[PDB]
Structures are given as structure tokens and as C-alpha cells.
């Protein structure tokens, strides 16, 4: 998974969460869009 | 890269970048990328930021460049001790004061220009914003 | 009335029997034979004319052939023998390629009304004529 400094929503089904303080972008659609950090 | 066609002098003093900018109002286009940050845009950054903007709006639209370098910046060659004269002008820069309109654009939708100026801003070191030509 | 299964509105001039460069694999893409669009394709075509691209329903079943009700040619190609020029757009408002008149196009519009769906003819009129407007053609009202 990507761990970029910037984590904007790629697909439409991307959703921003902030688990354990660390911001993440979970995508229920495409597993490639899953990313951390930012 | 933008560069003066012949000048009175080849090298010039560093100088300070103090003060508010004069290019405050939008004067040509309907929009603009005003420079909030205090810096010194090099020629390569203007040509580069322009590319990543002239392409962003495709063949349509019209862009103005409100700044021009006209300040030669010298550099000392690597592994050379201090002294022995002023270095060699390696590149040209334009000093940028806060509130200094950089790029202007017309003939494009407000949102399209809104996206085009995000990319050119991405290319530029100084902090920027977005402005619109208010009638008087 | 069963929904979507295989019916597709695609074929060239109705005078071109058993096509392969135009349609070919497209009509015989399913289990239906290539022969089915020549022996049966002109069984209704001969009654009117030939050389006119007229769409027909192709609701394929497991019963070899299929049920169909032929419809109506597009206004676009109708505007060649009924427009003068065989061309069309490319330059819509950039130049006036051709022109007809509401007295003729409204006159042809109600002919296709067997396929068209409208509460009154006038509507179909401005509809089809506007279709003509898209071609760079401007109606001489």
C-alpha cells in the first residue's frame, strides 16, 4: 500500500478515516487506492 | 527561460526583498494567481509553471505573465575559495513580495482556471492564492 | 414483453444483402446464422426501397431465428436524397452547409410517426427538424 505524505481521495468510493491518529484512505472498491500517512 | 535581452550591467548586488508588492490588482485577465509568499521566482520556475498551465487549459484561454527576472544571480564554482571576485551569473530571478500577482488568465471557466492555478502554484516555491478582477 | 436479451439496432443500407465489412460478425456474433440477414432481410425491404439504412429489432432466442419488427431510417441519412447534399456537419455553425424548410421537413416528419412517439405532430416536427439543425443545416422557416 502507498504511504504518501499527501493522501487525497483517488476514486469516488474513497473514504478518509483517522485510526490510531494516523490518517488513512480506505477504498471499499479498489484495493490499490488504499493508502496511509498524510 | 525568460531573460533580459542585453542589460546595462552583467552582475548586481544581492539586496533585500523587503516591502509590499505593487502588482496587487488584477489588471489584464479575469482571474489571477496572486503571490502571498515572500520569495524569488527563478526563470525556470516561471517557464515550468507556465508549461504546467498552458497545457492545463489546452489550446483555449489566454495567459499573462506579470513578472520578469531581470536580476542576474551569480554562483561560485564548486571547490573554489571565497574571494577572487564576484561569481558567474548562473541564472536569473524575479524578487517576489507578498500580494504580487504572478499569472493572469481569461477566456476560461472560473473552476477550470481554479484547477490550472493549482498546478502552476504546485510548481512555484512561494505560497499563493486565487483572485478575481473586481470591477473598480 | 421481455426486456433486453440480444436485440440491437445496427445495419447499413437495406439494399446491401448479407454484409460482412459493414455488419457481418456483428449480426452473426450470436448463434443466429449469417444467412438470416439476406433471405429474411429483404423480405420486408423490397416492399419500399433499397439503399436506405433502416434499423430493425434483433431479439435473439434459443429458437435459432428471432422475432422482429422493422422500424424507421434515421433522419440523418434521409437528408441526402431529401436535402440535396449527401454530406452534413463537420462545420455546423462555422458555415451553412445546407438548408431545407419547415414546409418540407414537417411534411416528411409525420411519415416516420409510426415509429415516433409524441402527443401531437408539431412536437415531432421541431424534434426531427432540430436533428436537422445539428447537421449544420438551418431550416428556412
Amino acid at each position: 500500500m502507498k504511504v504518501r505524505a499527501s493522501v487525497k481521495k483517488l476514486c469516488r468510493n474513497c473514504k478518509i478515516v483517522k485510526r490510531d491518529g494516523v490518517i488513512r484512505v480506505i477504498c471499499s472498491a479498489e484495493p490499490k487506492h488504499k493508502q496511509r500517512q498524510g | 527561460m525568460l531573460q533580459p535581452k542585453r542589460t546595462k550591467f552583467r552582475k548586481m548586488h544581492k539586496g533585500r526583498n523587503r516591502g509590499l508588492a505593487q502588482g496587487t490588482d488584477v489588471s489584464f485577465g479575469s482571474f489571477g494567481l496572486k503571490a502571498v509568499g515572500r520569495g524569488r521566482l527563478t526563470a525556470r520556475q516561471i517557464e515550468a509553471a507556465r508549461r504546467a498551465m498552458t497545457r492545463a487549459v489546452k489550446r483555449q484561454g489566454k495567459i499573462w505573465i506579470r513578472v520578469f527576472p531581470d536580476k542576474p544571480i551569480t554562483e561560485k564554482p564548486l571547490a573554489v575559495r571565497m574571494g577572487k571576485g564576484k561569481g558567474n551569473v548562473e541564472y536569473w530571478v524575479a524578487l517576489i513580495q507578498p500580494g504580487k500577482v504572478l499569472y493572469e488568465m481569461d477566456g476560461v471557466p472560473e473552476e477550470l482556471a481554479r484547477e490550472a492555478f493549482k498546478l502552476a502554484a504546485a510548481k512555484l516555491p512561494i505560497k499563493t492564492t486565487f483572485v478575481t478582477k473586481t470591477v473598480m | 414483453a421481455k426486456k433486453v436479451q440480444a436485440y440491437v439496432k445496427l445495419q447499413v443500407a437495406a439494399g446491401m444483402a448479407n454484409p460482412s465489412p459493414p455488419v457481418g460478425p456483428a449480426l452473426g456474433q450470436q448463434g443466429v446464422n449469417i444467412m438470416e440477414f439476406c433471405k429474411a432481410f429483404n423480405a420486408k425491404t423490397d416492399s419500399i426501397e433499397k439503399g436506405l439504412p433502416i434499423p430493425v429489432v434483433i431479439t435473439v432466442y434459443a429458437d435459432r431465428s428471432f422475432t422482429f419488427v422493422t422500424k424507421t431510417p434515421p433522419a440523418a441519412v434521409l437528408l441526402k436524397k431529401a436535402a440535396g447534399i449527401k454530406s452534413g456537419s463537420g462545420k455546423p455553425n462555422k458555415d451553412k452547409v445546407g438548408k431545407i424548410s419547415r414546409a418540407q421537413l414537417q411534411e416528411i416528419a409525420q411519415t416516420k410517426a409510426a415509429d415516433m412517439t409524441g402527443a401531437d405532430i408539431e412536437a415531432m416536427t421541431r424534434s426531427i427538424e432540430g436533428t436537422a439543425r445539428s447537421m449544420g443545416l438551418v431550416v428556412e422557416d
Partner: protein, 131 residues
């Protein structure tokens, strides 16, 4: 959605169609198709023109809002998805029976064809119309 002017506009427009209206019927296509749009509304074209309004907007504060000024008995028709069907040419025309027959003509459902108001009655299949 556009504000009060437009909602109220369409509603008062519906009220003007009751001023010169007559027989009406219900219809509830929870699973309708545009194919059926070209049956009852093509039938509208078979009657005269565009004027006929299925105006499916039975919000208790929308279509039922135009109810207190015209036909208050239709207030109980309000609940669930409902589309009122007014008429104008031919008093007590055949538009009513076409909902019952059309529903049996591949249309899933039709609000249990309870009908509306001419004798202030209820769900009643009636061929008893001026023919």
C-alpha cells in the same frame, strides 16, 4: 429543489386542472418502466395532447396541499406512492378503465386501482361510462 414559488406554482397549476377537470384515477408504479410511459401517455396523445398530468407528487404537503381547495375526499388517497389522473375532454371518459386494463397488461401494479371522485366512491371497476 427550487423554492416555494415553483412547488406552489406546479400545485396551483394542478388546482386549475381540477377547475375544468372531472373523473380521476390512481396509479402507483413502484416498479414502472418508460415503456409504459408510451402507453398511458401515448394514450394521452390518443385523447388530445400534452395537457394530461400524471403529476406523481403525492407528498402530504404537496399534492395533498392542493386538496383543501379542491376535492377534500382525495386526502385519504395521499399516503404511499400515488399519481392523480385528471381529465378534461369527454366527461367521465375511458381514461379510468385504462389503468385497470393496463395493469393486467404487463405493469406489475397500479395502486390497487381504487379510483378517485365522480360519485365520491371507491375501488370499483366500471365500464359504466358514457359511450
Amino acid at each position: 429543489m427550487a423554492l416555494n414559488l415553483q412547488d406552489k406554482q406546479a400545485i396551483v397549476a394542478e388546482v386549475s386542472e381540477v377547475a375544468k377537470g372531472a373523473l380521476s384515477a390512481v396509479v402507483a408504479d413502484s416498479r414502472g418502466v418508460t415503456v409504459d410511459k408510451m402507453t398511458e401517455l401515448r394514450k394521452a396523445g390518443r385523447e388530445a395532447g400534452v395537457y394530461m398530468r400524471v403529476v406523481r407528487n403525492t407528498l402530504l404537503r404537496r399534492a395533498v396541499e392542493g386538496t383543501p381547495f379542491e376535492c377534500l375526499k382525495d386526502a385519504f388517497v395521499g399516503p404511499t406512492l400515488i399519481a392523480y389522473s385528471m381529465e378534461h375532454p369527454g366527461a367521465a371518459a375511458r381514461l379510468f378503465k385504462e389503468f385497470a386494463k393496463a395493469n393486467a397488461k404487463f405493469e406489475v401494479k397500479a395502486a390497487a386501482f381504487e379510483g378517485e371522485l365522480i360519485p365520491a366512491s371507491q375501488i370499483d371497476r366500471l365500464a359504466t361510462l358514457p359511450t
